[PDB]
């Protein structure tokens, strides 16, 4: 199939990973 | 094509001691000749390669002269 | 005489340097209502011309449907491309119960009482092809008896035999 | 009722076929033995369908019918030509224009144009116009007569078609099957017997075998012609 | 050098002779035309009509 779907999925996963990197310390302090 | 001189009824055994039988199977640079340019079967080609490597390890053939 | 059923007019187009070139495709069913039907698919720059080509193609390819009095011999299911059409005999006086393309094909063929259902690929051309295949899957009782080499009585049920008696 | 005997066609090489690699399994029915990398055709079946093909040709041309001698491979080229000229029957030898049988109404105009060219030749109009025009017209004449040698007698349609080496001229067999015309052909060991109605198993790559088969068919059609 | 090809890619340098790589190259032409003594001019004339460099 076309790689457009894979592009959407990788963008979503990348954004989630960046969010996790940004809030790692806050999650640890609240967890 | 060519003949596997070992599959014949007169096929001499492959050993790492008889150096001439191996020298006839390596090129002038000392590299092992390909199977197609020789024509021997796969098992005999592998035995020839193993014997050549062993003879090199015991300093009977040069390492790429 | 003959009856006709123009079941689908479509406007197709191909892209060229200047722009889009449009042509018209007509799917026409030609029959007599007495047991013979045919399907044609014509294409031309104008609708009436495409209809004429479809009519001549349908007349060229005729096919006799094994009617038994007023209905098909036995229930069948035909598949062509992704279109699936199931046909079932009905009691006299039921009338034609079918979708658009199926109704046109069966009315042209001359079937008066039949239950037809299309179970996929609502596209008209494939539904027509599936209906044609399902009709081609029908077998007359005499053909079955000849195939099995047994008397017609020993093969068909008494209902079909009595239906044949009244129809003749 | 065989004009030729079992020794006659056998000497030519009809029993020969093709290589084992290029064989069609559907010919196992008419295969007798495989030797020296080629298959051998049993001649008894060849006889018991050559008599049937003889009978069918007799009946067809007897009731006001016509046949077509079709063959494009050079091995059976000249043969069929001369056979047609000894019976006065349509034939094709050079090349099968795709669609003689199916597109008959269109190709008949070619015969009309050829007749017009012959009429012009009789009237002798080779100098009333430019030299280039008359040269082009002469080339068109030659090309049309070369492409359509035995087609000038095709009035309505062939009643039957005779084909050599069905594999080479698959277009003619396809046209005949589309029109329902019943094809009588000499299948080899690599052909398809489902596409031919009345086959005659045998070799077609040998000029002698093809010539002998054409002799048989021509004799059958001549006898039918004498018994109208 | 060899990977990928483009419109302006450098054309491959091809020698006049057929490649025939060292594998089974062999020596299958052995002329012995003349060894009668000659002078420079006579040798040049023997060159010229033989069309040999």
């Amino acid at each position: 199939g076309s790689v457009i779907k894979k592009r959407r999925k990788r963008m979503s996963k990348k954004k989630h990973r960046k969010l996790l990197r940004r809030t790692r310390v806050q999650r640890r302090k609240l967890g | 094509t060519r003949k596997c001189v070992f599959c014949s009824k007169k096929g001499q055994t492959i050993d790492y001691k008889d150096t001439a039988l191996l020298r006839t199977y390596i090129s002038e640079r000392g590299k092992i000749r390909a199977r197609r340019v020789t024509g021997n079967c796969v098992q005999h080609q592998r035995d020839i390669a193993v014997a050549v490597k062993n003879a090199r390890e015991v300093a009977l053939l040069p390492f790429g002269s | 005489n003959y009856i006709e059923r123009v079941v689908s007019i479509n406007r197709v187009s191909k892209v060229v340097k200047g722009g889009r070139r449009f042509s018209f495709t007509a799917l026409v069913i030609v029959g007599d209502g007495k047991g013979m039907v045919g399907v044609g698919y014509g294409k031309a720059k104008e609708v009436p011309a495409a209809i004429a080509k479809g009519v001549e193609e349908a007349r060229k390819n005729f096919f006799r449907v094994p009617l038994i009095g007023s209905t098909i011999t036995h229930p069948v299911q035909g598949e062509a491309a992704a279109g699936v059409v199931m046909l079932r005999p009905a009691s006299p006086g039921t009338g034609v119960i079918a979708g658009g393309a199926a109704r046109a094909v069966l009315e042209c063929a001359g079937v008066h009482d039949i239950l037809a259902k299309s179970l996929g690929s609502d596209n008209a051309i494939n539904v027509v092809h599936a209906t044609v295949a399902a009709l081609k899957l029908l077998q007359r009782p005499e053909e079955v008896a000849a195939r099995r080499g047994l008397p017609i009585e020993d093969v068909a049920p008494a209902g079909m035999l009595k239906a044949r008696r009244e129809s003749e | 009722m065989a004009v030729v005997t079992m020794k006659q066609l056998l000497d030519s090489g009809a029993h020969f076929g093709h290589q084992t690699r290029r064989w069609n399994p559907k010919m196992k029915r008419f295969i007798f033995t495989d030797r020296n990398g080629i298959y051998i055709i049993d001649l008894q079946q060849t006889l018991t369908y050559i008599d049937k093909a003889y009978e069918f040709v007799k009946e067809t041309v007897a009731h006001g019918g016509t046949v077509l001698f079709v063959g494009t491979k050079k091995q059976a080229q000249e043969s069929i030509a001369e056979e047609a000229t000894r019976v006065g029957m349509p034939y094709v030898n050079q090349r099968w224009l795709g669609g003689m049988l199916t597109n008959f109404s269109t190709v008949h105009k070619r015969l009309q144009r050829l007749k017009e060219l012959e009429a012009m030749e009789q009237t002798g109009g080779f100098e009333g116009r430019t030299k280039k025009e008359i040269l082009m017209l002469t080339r068109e004449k030659n090309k049309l007569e070369r492409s359509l040698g035995g087609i000038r007698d095709m009035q309505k349609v062939p009643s039957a078609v005779w084909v050599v080496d069905t594999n080479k001229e698959h277009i003619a067999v396809g046209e005949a099957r589309k029109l329902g015309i019943p094809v009588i052909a000499i299948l080899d060991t690599n052909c398809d017997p489902d596409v031919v109605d009345y086959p005659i198993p045998g070799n077609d790559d040998a000029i002698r075998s093809a010539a002998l088969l054409t002799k048989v068919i021509a004799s059958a059609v001549a006898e039918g012609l004498q018994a109208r | 050098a060899g990977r990928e090809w483009r419109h302006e890619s450098e054309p491959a340098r091809r020698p006049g002779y057929f490649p025939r790589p060292p594998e089974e190259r062999r020596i299958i032409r052995r002329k012995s035309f003349s060894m009668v003594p000659c002078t420079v001019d006579e040798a040049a004339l023997e060159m010229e009509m033989l069309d040999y460099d």
């Binding site: - | - | 229930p75 195939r147 093969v155 079909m160 | - | -």
Partner: protein, 131 residues
């Protein structure tokens, strides 16, 4: 592994019919022989017989083809299979091709067709459909 010998027999018959084979050979059993005899009596196969194989007995069935090289069997289906088994009462016996086909039913009286079971007023397991 082999789970349904009857389904295997039906598929062998179908494959042989589609390939225009004239003979089919397969391992023999009483149920297969009985359904083969039922098929022969209904005129769906030419004739069946049993040879002796290397270990057990065999079953050789000749397929029937009409003069025009067309098949005398148009369809072969297995109804009651291991897992989901189908049993029919004497009043709700199945009809195949609107009665044109034949339904094989195993009743306490042996192997019958749909019409025979209906006439004798018995029911059983609907083994297969033939048409």
């Amino acid at each position: 592994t082999m789970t349904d010998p009857i389904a295997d027999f039906l598929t062998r018959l179908r494959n042989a019919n589609s390939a225009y084979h004239d003979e089919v050979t397969l391992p023999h059993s009483k149920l297969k022989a009985n359904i083969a005899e039922i098929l022969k009596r209904e005129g769906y196969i030419s004739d069946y017989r049993t040879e002796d194989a290397r270990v057990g007995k065999s079953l050789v069935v000749q397929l029937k083809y009409g003069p025009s090289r067309e098949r005398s069997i148009a369809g072969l289906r297995r109804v009651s299979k291991p897992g989901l088994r189908v049993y029919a009462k004497s009043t709700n016996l199945p009809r195949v091709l609107g009665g044109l086909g034949v339904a094989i039913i195993s009743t306490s009286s042996g192997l019958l067709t749909d019409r025979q079971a209906a006439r004798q007023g018995v029911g059983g397991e609907v083994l297969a459909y033939v048409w």
